[PDB]
Design a binder for these strands. Structure first.
Lengths: 91, 78, 94, 104, 93, 104, 95, 80
DNA sequence: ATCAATATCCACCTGCAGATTCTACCAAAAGTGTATTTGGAAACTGCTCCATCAAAAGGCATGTTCAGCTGAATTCAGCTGAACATGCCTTTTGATGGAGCAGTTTCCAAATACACTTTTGGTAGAATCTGCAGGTGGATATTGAT
DNA sequence: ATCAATATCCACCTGCAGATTCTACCAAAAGTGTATTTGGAAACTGCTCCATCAAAAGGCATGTTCAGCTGAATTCAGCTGAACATGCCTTTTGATGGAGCAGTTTCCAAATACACTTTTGGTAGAATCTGCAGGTGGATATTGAT
């Protein structure tokens, strides 16, 4: 029965607190988060499968993300990826 | 019913498409072409449908077919 | 107004807008009609007919964009079936 | 105590980790994977949303609508290259009239 | 390292359709990455179909629908033909 | 003591296919029917190419099929060509065709 | 022979054939050079360099097929940079 | 290694184009084609090498080139 | 170039309907905590496979030459598509009714998963076989100027 | 219309490098028998989905009038193809060193597998607000004429 809509709204209220979002637009955002989800994850799975490991680690998601996001988006994506894994390792 | 697609609505399309001057024979080409496009989406959709044993073709079915044709579409599902 | 300029002011009239430009109904029956050649007794979510519309039109604005380039390329200003058929073989549909 | 807040995200590391094994992408998922993935989706999400709200607000209004999304994706070189084969329903196209079609 | 391949089978099939004829090495290679590419197309689509219709088991029914999705025209027809007749001639113990 | 390929009269491996199916993670459970059907569809398609190929081999003078013969066989069958529409065949060359306009 | 016909039996000379048409070496040197901008001390399987050859050539033959069509479309017979630039924008390579 | 791109000769290009069914070739075609060829390689290899150094290897394999090529949707049979 | 009449917008204003956001609940996930398992990381090392190098040979690129034929630019006429204004009709819409069917539950029969123990089928070289690459030489079309 | 000037075939041969076959394990199917999910198979909500109606509206169909633009044909200049001699560097064949892929073992650091223990997220009302639809009014922006 679920969606990501809640989260997209949290993040929205970080980058533009005074700003809101149409419904049809939130819909656009949701099938987006799922498209990217699916893309990264699939690529991770191929990487597991090619390099014969039955476990997907943050490392796969990383290589996947450098494969799929173009230019500087991959750079920053990889950044906040590893930053969240490090600040997670701590607690 | 394909002729339900009017010449002013085609020319509205092409106008959004940034066209300034449009031949006459464009219209029956565009009709041919649109017919083909639909035929392929729909065929795939309806296939997704009667795989689910349904007699109602859902939006999400149309979404999936569109993703297979590589014409991915946001705002109905994925 | 001179032949050429209602066209241009159409071009920007319809480009700032996100309206579907085929009428909802005739479209709907074309959808249903084509469907009817693949399965019978078929019933459509209203939204599926909608998504099919957004798709088909979006695609058509795209094809008109390329076809526009084929014409501009070929000395011209006026799009013709040779233009659409080029865009469709280069795009690799045909 | 949830692990999203434990990694300082606002996307769900849990729901993501779940979706990950329950998709069959392999048989075993590193504990890092859902964290990282959760993050990349949160980053990308914010990047679109920001360019969007900027567009909305430049265009008169307090909230983002499909037009604002399509504007935001098609003006950023990179986001547009990521979403190159995606149709944003209800979004319209960007303004472009070939130089040649222009008067005099 | 056991380098697994379909080469035995592709040659069997070859000697069904052209008993007098053989095949290059590079040609056989072409044949293999082909069988794997088609394998992947079919299987993946079958799996998505699984996930879509919320079933955690892939049956022949998916391999079928997947095949009508990927093979164009009469190739899908005959592929479905010999898919179905091989499963039926399989059910008979 | 009876094989599953021979149990369906295939000469592609039903067992080895069933394996590849579980060891890919396309899902967590693979019906007993599935690998049979798949094994068949792969044997069929294989036979269709090999057929057009060997035909191409003999009018192209030769006793065995080479990448040139495969590329001919596929780019001349409408359907096969469209199945393999985005595949490059190494050492296969192009099909012969010269635009009408360029001719004397 | 009048200009036009050596062209034509070149066209069919090279269409009946499946040989790579860029020389193996200068190619290999380009590959190696470009790679070294992404990682260094990189070593290539000979077959990898081979696949890269087969691919990029197939891609270029294709782009020439399309470009040929763009020129033919535009009054012409002779392929030019604007043609490739078209084929690539329509193909949506650089859009 | 420096500027090896010009090793891609104007007669070898014109061989490509001849296979491509071209009859008459401009001059400026050649470095356009060079531009394009370099771009193409840059993309394939960028991905390839990435696949390599995911595998913690210093040798870039054929299969890596295969995989990138599959990702670019330019699938390749016969090394795969 | 400006001139003034058209037609087109855009800005600034505005009351209110339809959404969007906000809140209040609990079934349902996600997190805890424990006891097992298991992959893949660590650590040698066996050996392809790659990088050089050399050397001899031609196979191709270069540079040049030069003329034809093709691209580019103009000319021009006819005719096609834009523009506009009209009269009508097809779509839109706004609930309302009737009901075909998606969507949920509740079980179990049938189907599939395990876990070893058997019983071959398939791989890796080794032992054979034989299309085919390369080489020749007049036959067989193409091509081109008078 | 024809030959000559060329280039291409097609047939005809041979020793080889490359399939093809043969052999010998070895790892992977296949067989058996409990041990489970799972996805139908019925039985039924509650929903969208049709199908009308009926206005009223605007969006389309038509026809006229004509400007501008599409094509055809010309002309010319330059530029690209054909041709060839020059000599270069890519290619082949074999040897040499060794780098870094792979394969195996060893065995924890990491993930799984439950059963509760907490808390989150979704649904459906509850509580504002953002646009929308509509309106002059001012310049914009074209347009043809002195």
């Amino acid at each position: 029965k679920e969606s990501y809509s809640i989260y997209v709204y949290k993040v929205l209220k970080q980058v533009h607190p005074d700003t809101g979002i149409s419904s049809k637009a939130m819909g656009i955002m949701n099938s987006f988060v799922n498209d990217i989800f699916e893309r990264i994850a699939g690529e991770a799975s191929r990487l597991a499968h090619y390099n014969k490991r039955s476990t997907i680690t943050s490392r796969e998601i990383q290589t996947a993300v450098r494969l799929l996001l173009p230019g500087e988006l991959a750079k920053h994506a990889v950044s906040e990826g590893t930053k969240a894994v490090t600040c997670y390792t701590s607690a | 019913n394909i002729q339900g697609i009017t010449c002013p609505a085609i020319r509205r399309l092409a106008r959004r498409g940034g066209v300034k001057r449009i031949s006459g024979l464009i219209y029956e080409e565009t009709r041919g072409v649109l017919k083909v496009f639909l035929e392929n989406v729909i065929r795939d959709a309806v296939t997704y449908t009667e795989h689910a044993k349904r007699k109602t073709v859902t939006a999400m079915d149309v979404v999936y077919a569109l993703k297979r044709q590589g014409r991915t579409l946001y705002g109905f599902g994925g | 107004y001179r032949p050429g300029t209602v066209a241009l002011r159409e071009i920007r009239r319809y480009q700032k807008s996100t309206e579907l430009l085929i009428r909802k109904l005739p479209f709907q029956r074309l959808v249903r009609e084509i469907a009817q050649d693949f399965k019978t007794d078929l019933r459509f979510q209203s939204s599926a007919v909608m998504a099919l519309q957004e798709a088909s039109e979006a695609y058509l604005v795209g094809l008109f964009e390329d076809t526009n380039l084929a014409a501009i390329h070929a000395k011209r200003v006026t799009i013709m079936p040779k233009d659409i058929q080029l865009a469709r073989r280069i795009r690799g549909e045909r | 105590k949830t692990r999203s807040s434990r990694a300082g995200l606002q996307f769900p590391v849990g729901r993501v980790h779940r979706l990950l094994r329950k998709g069959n992408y392999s048989e075993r998922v590193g504990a890092g994977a859902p964290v990282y993935l959760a993050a990349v989706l949160e980053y990308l999400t914010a990047e679109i949303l920001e360019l969007a709200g900027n567009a909305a607000r430049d265009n008169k209004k307090t909230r983002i609508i499909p037009r604002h999304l399509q504007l935001a994706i098609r003006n950023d070189e990179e986001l547009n290259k990521l979403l190159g084969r995606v149709t944003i329903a209800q979004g319209g196209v960007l303004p472009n009239i070939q130089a040649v079609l222009l008067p005099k």
